[PDB]
Design a protein around this ligand. Structure first.
Ligand code: BSW
Length: 154
């Protein structure tokens, strides 16, 4: 009933890396790096793979920080997004035809140009909290209803 996705935030003490997606689903918004998990791959391995594909960066250990389920009314499949963070990467962020990376100071996170749910859970990430969330959307701009709770085990 749900499809697995990953989302990785490279979050360091004073800055966070986001990428502006150029095409496809979510294009035109700043976000972390991620995508669909493949057959025979663990969620964390898929998170690591997608970070490389989309940003050019190599991460070793990833830390689980959240799970968010998205419902888009009128679409049957829920999107089960597993969120991870890291403070330690190798490589320089790469701009490609699919993605434009940029570092942001923590006070300048571009919420108006991000998915609207990020305004709810990104501040929990910044304060090193973990969470379970569920957001029901109509279209890509309107949150009809949501739940969001902090957890000790993701
Ligand atoms: F950007 C996506 C890509 N694939 C699946 C789900 C999302 C998504 C949907 C709604 N809000 C979001 N905030 C951060 C990611 C995200």
């Amino acid at each position: 009933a749900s499809r697995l996705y990953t989302l990785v935030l490279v979050l360091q003490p004073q800055r966070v890396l986001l990428g502006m997606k150029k095409r496809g689903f979510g294009a035109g918004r700043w976000n972390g790096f991620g995508g669909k998990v493949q057959e025979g791959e663990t969620i964390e391995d898929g998170a690591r793979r997608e970070l490389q594909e989309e940003s050019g960066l190599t991460v070793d250990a990833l830390h689980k920080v959240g799970q968010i389920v998205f419902e888009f009314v009128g679409e049957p499949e829920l999107m089960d997004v597993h969120v991870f963070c890291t403070d330690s990467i190798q490589g320089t962020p790469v701009e490609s035809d699919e993605m434009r990376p940029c570092w942001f100071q923590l006070d300048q996170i571009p919420f108006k140009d991000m998915w609207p749910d990020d305004s709810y859970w990104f501040p929990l990430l910044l304060q090193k909290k973990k969470f379970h969330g569920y957001f029901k959307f109509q279209g890509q701009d309107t949150i009809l209803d949501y739940t969001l709770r902090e957890v000790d085990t993701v």
